[PDB]
Design a protein around this ligand. Structure first.
Ligand SMILES: CCCCCCCCCCCCCCCCCC(=O)OC[C@H](COP(=O)([O-])OCC[N+](C)(C)C)OC(=O)CCCCCCCCCCCCCCCCC
Ligand SMILES: CCCCCCCCCCCCCCCCCC(=O)OC[C@H](COP(=O)([O-])OCC[N+](C)(C)C)OC(=O)CCCCCCCCCCCCCCCCC
Ligand SMILES: CCCCCCCCCCCCCCCCCC(=O)OC[C@H](COP(=O)([O-])OCC[N+](C)(C)C)OC(=O)CCCCCCCCCCCCCCCCC
Ligand SMILES: CCCCCCCCCCCCCCCCCC(=O)OC[C@H](COP(=O)([O-])OCC[N+](C)(C)C)OC(=O)CCCCCCCCCCCCCCCCC
Ligand SMILES: CCCCCCCCCCCCCCCCCC(=O)OC[C@H](COP(=O)([O-])OCC[N+](C)(C)C)OC(=O)CCCCCCCCCCCCCCCCC
Ligand SMILES: CCCCCCCCCCCCCCCCCC(=O)OC[C@H](COP(=O)([O-])OCC[N+](C)(C)C)OC(=O)CCCCCCCCCCCCCCCCC
Ligand SMILES: CCCCCCCCCCCCCCCCCC(=O)OC[C@H](COP(=O)([O-])OCC[N+](C)(C)C)OC(=O)CCCCCCCCCCCCCCCCC
Ligand SMILES: *[C@@H]1O[C@H](CO)[C@@H](O)[C@H](O)[C@H]1NC(C)=O
Ligand SMILES: [Ca+2]
Ligand SMILES: [Ca+2]
Lengths: 166, 1276
């Protein structure tokens, strides 16, 4: 009862469901970094490296961060199954792994950031793009949101000593 | 175990062995050893002087006399005379040196040379009273054991995390083009590089970063090899040199990640030594609360000192009637002396004297030094008269009896002696300086004031005689380590180099400065890096000389932490005796929550301005974001004044609200002209201070501290007099010195000019030609104001060595330094440093003793038995049974029958320990066969730990498995490990995996899970995190204001490397200016940053400054700034010290010997054995077997079972419910009343209803009579 009923989990679960949609947006989107040689300008993506001059020619060649992002959506699938089973039998405890899965969904997005930040250094002029900024805010939503839902799931240190951690 | 028990004439030896003065003959011969080892001058490569060569033969005297003694001690008793353990070392010292004579004949080696250092420990065992001290010093070490064992786990976590994150990262260099020389700039430490991104472009112009070794300090500050990681997170923990290990990583990886490693090592290293100092002060205070009940004896004491008060007074009534024309002069000497006049005639003289003695320049042009001599001549003529008027009209015997006027005798005589001795002329110029320093004692004339002065000296001088036992142990501790270090290092500081390794040990005083330097913590880093590099620099056998500078710094502080208690037990003995519309708006939720959200957006832009561009895109955005924000602000001060009016300024929050708003409005008047400027911008920072007065926690903390200042004020007013008195003796003795010429060979004014040669590295084939000028050593002693500056930094234990070693090297007025002239001027910096250490400690004890009064002020409302007797009632009245989540399904029940046992308990504890050492090894340039094994290991230890959470989840049936947080923490580790295995091997089909590795480390935190005595100490602090974080809010605010004030002001500051404002230590951005202030908050060489901000620094060629003005961006507000930051950091960190007394007070006043709740907390765990269904009602049959298995502090005897415990339980009014199922609460109350002593009926029923009144008085819930039904269960 008492975890789920307070609005503390209301605001925090809602914020997460924003960043879930942002995360699903940031994976399938194609604008991470601007290739700008000066033409044969392009945008790095997790699945496609599309060449643009107005002629748009999309293909692909950064292998690592693609397979990582599969794992990041895999926890976002599992992190929502546990949350939907939570509210329906007065079971509070399933928020405990559900807050865990969002954090690893956050960190594996952060790895996909720093691999793509690394592949720029391999290669001409570069700047970042909008879906990279989408992936930064999808991190902060999830990583703070998973931790805050973890803290809100656990009860209060016994404060006084005769009701320790139950 | 006696030896043959014989009686020859040897029995007469026993009458001579133990006579009377046999102690005295052995005291006078061990003291000779102390001098025999003090004049031992060590020599570098097997050399011996003459006196060093004669003292080798003098050991054979002290070999045989300690053998003539000890063999007679054998003849005296025998093998049972190893009974004194302090005599057990006696034969131990001798039995090595007899082996040394054997190895002496092998020559016709230096390991036994070091054991003769141990001999003055015999000087302890001889002299008693120091048998009191060493016995008392080990008895403090029992309650400190859990604090010290968590710091031992604090280092091992941060050694493994710093080992795996930073292995091999430092080894890059910035060598020249292709050479072997490491490229530096003139002060720049040889700091690493990286060819790849984020760290050091290496712009030293003709140099390229190549592998090999640039390294940290010389090899000693790595992060590979478990022993170096653990060494360089040790040094970091002592807040000394933690910024080089930060700025080296931050130079090799790149910043913005590794700051979070060290500023959580400091913030946890601070917090768990901050509660080590409060650890020792727990164990000895509870002893002293048991002697506070002699309140009727101070009633006898203050009568006796009232009797001593009258008896001296009436006797002066007798005295001044006996010695009584000349009486007509007498009444004149009552009416002039005791009048209001000499309360004010003397001050004009005295305040005119302390301006005479503190004028004191270097040059004093010509007229000042004539006034110095006439004033002294004039003001003595008032001194004698003032004295002489007390000579006639006060009584002769009354005058000399007072100690303060006996002091005034020594003043007036010495003034006359020093004036006439100059007129005699026959006096050395060494002596007239001494006479000048004698006058300086007149400053205590001022102290005829201070009303509690006689209370104050009685506080301090009573404390010293509680320290003079321990302080003589501290001085004999610093001798053993000075005699040891002279044997290990002993002029091995040869090094074939040219830099000054100045704190060497090749002397007895130089090893007595140098030990006392690493004792006080200042710069023991550079010292340890020389003892390591003297032997074998870094290697196997050689870095075990770290162990000398560890035990010197741990034990040498633990002695000095024990002078902190003996004061505190002595200082505790004295403490025992339409306006409706504007009315809603101010009280609206729409407006208050508006402001709190608006403050946070006001200061987020004000945090990160540019702040040095003045033209860029980050300005035009913020100028629109600033002027629009001043509008709302001023709008708020309208709506407050339309509710009350002009009389609302009473509150201290509204006096600041009307101050910051009016200045932000005039910036719009100052922006109205540009279309004064930046001053009014910074007056907008005050805002969030208003939000601090909207916080309530601080009202308790800040108020309790200003209670403590009222009683310590007396001490603070004296300790700032000594910094004026030792300024004026410091000026007097070091005027015009510290005036050093650039090449150290020219020694005077005119001829330190022109160009010279600076020879690089070491050899005279790399001449560079620089100019030379006078360098003035920046913290000179010239003015009394300019000497309070320098003596303020040696007061904060920061930067004294460099300054101290300068004060040694000085000679006559305008002359450069001579190398080791007059080491006798190191006694100034020692006595003063020791003194200020003693007045800084008496303040600290004050803030402790005051708060332990102020917390017990809440428990003066007592009418009750005791604190332990208070909590155990609240432990019985409030507690409830335990889970006991026992399963059905005997397939599953067999699985649970394994998991909760000691099979899994001892096995999963075991495989962490193998997982520790698997992470323990992990060194650098390891083999590829070892890389293959630890990659398997990691895979092995994940499969086991995920097999833990499989078996437990199939046992605990999800409900219960998420219940405890430790299992939820395991689920965080397991998945982070599985995603660490997968991420590594997908790569084998990758730098980013460095975070996922941390998850591999966190398994060590599963260790403390079973460590029951440690977890109970962390959980105390999380429960204590109540009154702390509002005090932490003022810390954050403090760092926030001083960041923004300096960022506009100390920008434009030209990040030239080598000049201590550099690329790691910027003032420019906001988080670089927070870290700089965290450097000055832990005292890390803040004295340089002050000198970096000045008036003649460069101005960062991105700013404007367009003609000429290229060396005028420094702003000397820095002296007003770093000093005013340093006291406001010192005062507020004391409020962190006070706030930890606040909530931990129940833990710091414990008595874990009488009624420790560890017996209570374990007592719930026997209930799960016999009541497994959570019914909360036992049978009255198996309570009987439950009594016998607890522990004899809370259970019963091993004489089991009885008619005694069974007599006890029938002797308790134990109720029997339906069928005889008892609750735990009635049983808990009876079995706590077994220790909480009791009587028969009459006193029992009187204790019951009084417990009903006391609990209901405590109960703010006037409802819930089930607690009164619980007293019907516990009492009836
Ligand atoms: C109970 C109270 C404490 C007891 C006090 C004494 C503690 C034990 C002291 C150990 C004796 C060390 C011998 C000193 C000379 C070393 C030998 C040598 O010359 O080799 C030089 C060589 C080269 O150094 P070198 O270059 O300077 O010398 C060259 C000169 N010739 C050629 C003549 C030798 O160094 C080595 O490679 C071997 C070093 C020996 C091992 C180093 C360990 C010594 C320090 C251990 C720490 C002890 C801490 C004491 C305080 C802690 C309290 C318990
Ligand atoms: C067990 C309980 C948990 C402890 C974890 C530590 C496990 C030790 C790791 C194994 C040691 C090892 O072999 O390292 C390899 C190294 C040796 O390997 P190596 O790398 O030098 O071998 C040479 C390889 N090349 C040629 C590439 C250079 O051994 C060490 O140097 C470890 C340091 C030894 C001393 C440090 C131990 C900790 C200090 C504790 C002080 C506490 C006192 C107060 C209480
Ligand atoms: C903790 C308090 C709040 C944290 C402050 C800001 C954290 C955000 C990190 C910013 C990252 C960034 O932008 O670049 C990295 C910043 C800026 O890097 P940079 O990129 O600007 O440097 C290179 C500049 N160019 C590229 C132009 C050449 O670098 C750092 O080093 C960050 C310093 C760490 C922050 C210091 C915190 C220590 C003090 C804590 C307060 C004391 C409180 C005591 C009470 C306890 C309560 C907690
Ligand atoms: C008050 C008690 C302490 C006063 C000691 C003052 C003596 C030094 C002096 O007067 O002028 C320096 C004088 C003035 O220097 P000088 O110009 O006369 O140089 C003399 C030249 N030779 C050496 C060749 C003859 O320096 C001295 O040489 C005096 C010798 C004493 C050196 C050490 C002094 C003690 C250290 C300070 C202790 C402070 C304790 C505070 C409590
Ligand atoms: C709370 C404790 C902190 C309050 C500090 C009050 C001192 C105000 C400092 C003003 C100042 O000196 O400006 C220096 C400099 C500007 O002054 P300046 O010295 O550089 O320019 C004038 C140059 N002369 C005098 C040589 C002609 O800093 C600033 O830009 C002003 C902002 C600081 C204001 C901080 C007070 C806020 C509260
Ligand atoms: C109680 C303990 C108090 C200690 C404070 C004593 C400060 C000594 C001042 C000496 C300054 C000096 O040497 O002059 C250098 C200069 C000498 O000229 P200079 O510029 O050639 O020397 C400076 C050295 N370099 C160039 C290397 C930077 O004197 C000046 O004219 C500069 C301005 C003088 C202002 C004096 C600073 C006083 C600071 C005290 C106020 C702090 C606020 C505290 C209130 C809040 C906390 C309670
Ligand atoms: C018994 C009880 C004891 C007390 C228990 C509490 C102890 C606390 C234990 C956790 C310590 C947390 C600090 C570790 C984080 C340090 C991050 C770091 O070092 O960054 C460097 C590393 C940098 O490694 P890097 O190699 O990937 O950097 C790339 C740079 N080049 C390519 C040039 C090599 O950063 C990280 O890997 C971690 C990043 C995120 C960490 C922040 C979240 C935590
Ligand atoms: C070193 O730098 C200066 C100016 O920064 C430049 O004039 C000079 O050419 C540089 N040296 C070399 C070898 O390029
Ligand atoms: Ca220090
Ligand atoms: Ca320091």
């Amino acid at each position: 009862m008492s975890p789920t009923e307070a609005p503390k989990v209301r605001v925090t679960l809602f914020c997460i469901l924003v960043g879930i949609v942002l995360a699903m947006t940031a994976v399938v989107s194609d604008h991470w970094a601007v290739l700008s040689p000066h033409c044969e300008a392009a945008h790095f993506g997790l699945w496609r490296i599309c060449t643009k001059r107005g002629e748009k020619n999309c293909s692909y060649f950064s292998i690592s961060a693609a397979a990582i992002s599969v794992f990041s959506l895999g926890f976002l699938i599992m992190g929502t199954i546990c949350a939907l089973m939570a509210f329906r039998k007065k079971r509070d405890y399933l928020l405990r792994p559900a807050s865990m899965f969002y954090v690893f969904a956050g960190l594996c997005l952060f790895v996909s950031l720093e691999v793509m930040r690394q592949s720029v250094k391999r290669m001409i002029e570069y700047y970042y793009s909008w879906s990279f900024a989408c992936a930064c805010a999808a991190f902060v939503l999830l990583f703070l949101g998973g931790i805050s839902l973890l803290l809100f799931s656990l009860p209060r240190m016994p404060q006084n000593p005769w009701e320790s951690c139950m | 175990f006696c030896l043959t028990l014989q009686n020859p004439l040897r029995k007469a030896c026993i009458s001579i062995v133990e006579w009377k003065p046999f102690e005295t003959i052995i005291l006078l011969t061990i003291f000779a050893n102390c001098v025999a080892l003090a004049v031992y001058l060590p020599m570098p490569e097997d050399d011996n002087n003459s006196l060093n060569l004669g003292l080798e033969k003098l050991e054979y005297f002290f070999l045989t006399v300690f053998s003539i003694e000890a063999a007679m001690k054998i003849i005296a008793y025998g093998f049972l005379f190893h009974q004194d353990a302090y005599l057990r070392s006696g034969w131990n010292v001798l039995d090595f040196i007899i082996v040394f004579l054997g190895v002496f004949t092998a020559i016709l080696v230096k390991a036994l040379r070091a054991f003769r250092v141990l001999r003055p420990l015999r000087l302890v065992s001889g002299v008693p009273s120091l048998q009191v001290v060493l016995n008392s010093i080990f008895k403090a070490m029992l309650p400190l054991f859990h604090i010290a064992l968590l710091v031992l786990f604090m280092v091992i976590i941060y050694a493994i995390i710093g080992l795996e994150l930073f292995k091999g990262k430092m080894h890059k260099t910035c060598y020249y083009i292709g050479t072997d020389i490491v490229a530096t700039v003139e002060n720049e430490k040889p700091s690493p590089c990286a060819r790849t991104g984020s760290g050091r472009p290496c712009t030293i112009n003709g140099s390229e970063c190549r592998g090999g070794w640039p390294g940290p300090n010389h090899g000693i500050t790595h992060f590979d090899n478990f022993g170096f990681s653990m060494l360089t997170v040790y040094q970091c923990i002592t807040m000394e040199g933690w910024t080089d290990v930060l700025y080296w990583v931050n130079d090799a990886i790149g910043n913005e990640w590794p700051w979070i490693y060290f500023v959580t090592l400091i913030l946890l290293g601070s917090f768990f030594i901050l509660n080590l100092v409060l650890g020792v002060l727990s164990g000895e205070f509870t002893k002293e609360r048991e002697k506070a009940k002699s309140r009727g004896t101070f009633q006898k004491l203050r009568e006796k000192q009232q009797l001593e008060e009258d008896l001296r007074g009436y006797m002066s009534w007798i005295t001044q009637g006996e010695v009584m024309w000349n009486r007509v002069f007498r009444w004149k000497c009552h009416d002039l002396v005791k009048s209001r006049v000499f309360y004010w005639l003397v001050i004009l003289i005295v305040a005119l004297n302390t301006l005479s003695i503190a004028s004191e320049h270097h040059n004093q042009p010509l007229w000042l030094t004539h006034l110095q001599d006439i004033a002294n001549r004039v003001l003595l003529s008032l001194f004698t008269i003032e004295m002489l008027l007390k000579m006639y009209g006060l009584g002769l015997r009354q005058y000399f009896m007072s100690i303060f006027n006996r002091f005034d005798c020594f003043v007036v005589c010495s003034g006359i002696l020093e004036l006439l001795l100059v007129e005699s002329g026959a006096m050395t110029p060494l002596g007239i300086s001494v006479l000048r320093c004698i006058r300086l004692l007149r400053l205590f004339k001022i102290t005829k004031y201070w009303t509690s002065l006689s209370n104050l000296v009685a506080s301090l001088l009573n404390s010293i005689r509680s320290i003079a036992s321990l302080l003589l142990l501290l001085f004999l501790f610093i001798i053993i380590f000075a005699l040891l270090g002279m044997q290990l290092f002993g002029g091995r500081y040869d090094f074939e180099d040219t830099e000054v390794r100045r704190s060497n040990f090749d002397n007895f005083p130089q090893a007595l400065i140098s030990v006392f330097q690493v004792l006080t913590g200042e710069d023991w880093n550079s010292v340890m890096y020389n003892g390591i590099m003297a032997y074998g620099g870094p290697s196997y056998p050689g870095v075990l000389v770290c162990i000398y500078f560890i035990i010197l710094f741990v034990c040498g502080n633990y002695i000095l932490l024990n002078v902190f208690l003996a004061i505190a037990v002595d200082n505790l003995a004295e403490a025992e005796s339409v306006r409706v519309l504007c009315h809603r708006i101010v009280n609206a939720t729409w407006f208050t929550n508006f402001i709190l959200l608006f403050i946070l957006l006001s200061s987020a832009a004000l945090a990160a301005e540019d702040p040095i561009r003045a033209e860029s895109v980050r300005n035009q955005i913020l100028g629109y974001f600033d002027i629009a924000f001043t509008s709302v602000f001023t709008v708020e001060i309208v709506l407050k004044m339309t509710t009350y009016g002009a009389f609302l300024h009473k509150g201290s929050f509204c006096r600041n609200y009307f101050n910051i708003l009016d200045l932000l409005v005039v910036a719009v008047s100052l922006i109205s002209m540009g279309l004064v400027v930046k001053i009014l911008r910074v007056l907008r920072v005050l805002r969030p201070l208003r939000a601090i007065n909207r916080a309530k926690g601080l009202k308790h903390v800040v108020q309790c501290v200003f209670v403590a200042i009222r009683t310590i004020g007396n001490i603070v007013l004296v300790t700032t007099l000594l910094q004026f008195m030792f300024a004026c003796i410091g000026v007097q003795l070091f005027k015009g010195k510290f005036f050093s010429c650039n090449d150290l060979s020219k020694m005077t004014e005119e001829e330190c000019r022109g160009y010279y040669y600076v020879y690089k590295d070491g050899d005279p084939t790399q001449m560079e030609l620089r100019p030379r000028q006078w360098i003035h050593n920046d913290f000179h002693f010239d003015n009394v104001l300019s000497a309070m500056m320098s003596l303020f930094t040696v007061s904060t234990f920061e930067g004294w060595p460099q300054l101290l070693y300068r004060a040694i090297d000085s000679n006559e007025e305008d002359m450069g330094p001579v190398y080791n002239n007059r080491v006798e001027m190191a006694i100034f910096f020692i006595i003063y440093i020791i003194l200020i250490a003693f007045f800084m400690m008496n303040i600290f004890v004050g803030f402790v003793i005051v708060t332990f009064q102020e917390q017990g002020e809440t428990e003066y409302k007592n009418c009750e038995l005791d604190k332990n007797q208070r909590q155990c009632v609240q432990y019985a009245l409030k507690a409830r049974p335990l889970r006991c989540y026992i399963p059905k399904n005997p397939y599953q029940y067999q699985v649970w029958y394994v998991v909760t046992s000691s099979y899994f308990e001892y096995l999963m504890f075991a495989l962490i320990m193998l997982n520790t050492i698997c992470l323990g090894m992990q060194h650098y340039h390891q083999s590829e066969e070892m890389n293959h094994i630890s990659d398997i290991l990691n895979v092995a230890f994940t499969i086991i730990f995920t097999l833990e959470m499989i078996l437990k989840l199939l046992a605990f049936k999800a409900r219960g498995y998420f219940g405890d947080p430790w299992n939820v923490f395991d689920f965080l580790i397991v998945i982070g490990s599985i995603i660490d295995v997968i991420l590594s091997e997908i790569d084998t089909f990758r730098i980013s995996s460095a975070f996922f590795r941390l998850f591999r480390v966190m398994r060590l935190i599963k260790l403390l899970s079973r460590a029951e005595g440690v977890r109970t100490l962390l959980w105390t602090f999380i429960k204590s995190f109540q009154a702390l974080p509002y005090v932490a809010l003022l810390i954050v605010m403090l760092f926030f204001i001083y960041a923004v004030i300096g960022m506009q002001m100390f920008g434009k500051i030209a990040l030239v490397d080598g000049t201590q404002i550099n690329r790691n230590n910027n003032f420019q951005t906001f988080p670089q200016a927070v870290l700089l202030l965290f450097r000055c908050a832990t005292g890390e060489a803040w004295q340089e940053i002050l000198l970096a901000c000045s008036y003649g620094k460069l101005c960062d060629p991105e700013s404007d400054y367009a003609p000429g003005e290229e060396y005028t961006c420094g702003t000397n507000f820095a002296y007003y700034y770093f000093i005013s930051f340093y006291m406001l950091c010192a005062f507020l960190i004391i409020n962190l010290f006070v706030a930890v007394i606040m909530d931990n007070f129940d833990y710091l006043t414990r008595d874990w010997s009488i009624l420790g709740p560890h017996h209570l907390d374990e007592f719930k765990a026997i209930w799960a054995e016999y009541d497994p269904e959570a019914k909360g009602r036992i049978k009255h049959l198996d309570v009987v077997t439950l009594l016998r298995r607890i522990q004899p502090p809370l259970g019963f005897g091993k004489f089991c079972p009885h008619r005694v415990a069974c007599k006890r339980l029938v002797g308790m009014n134990m109720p029997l419910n339906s069928d005889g199922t008892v609750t735990f609460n009635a049983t808990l109350f009876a079995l706590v009343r077994t220790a909480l002593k009791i009587k028969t009926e009459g006193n029992f029923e009187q204790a019951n209803e009084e417990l009903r009144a006391i609990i209901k008085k405590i109960w703010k819930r006037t409802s819930m009579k089930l607690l009164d039904q619980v007293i019907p269960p516990i009492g009836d």
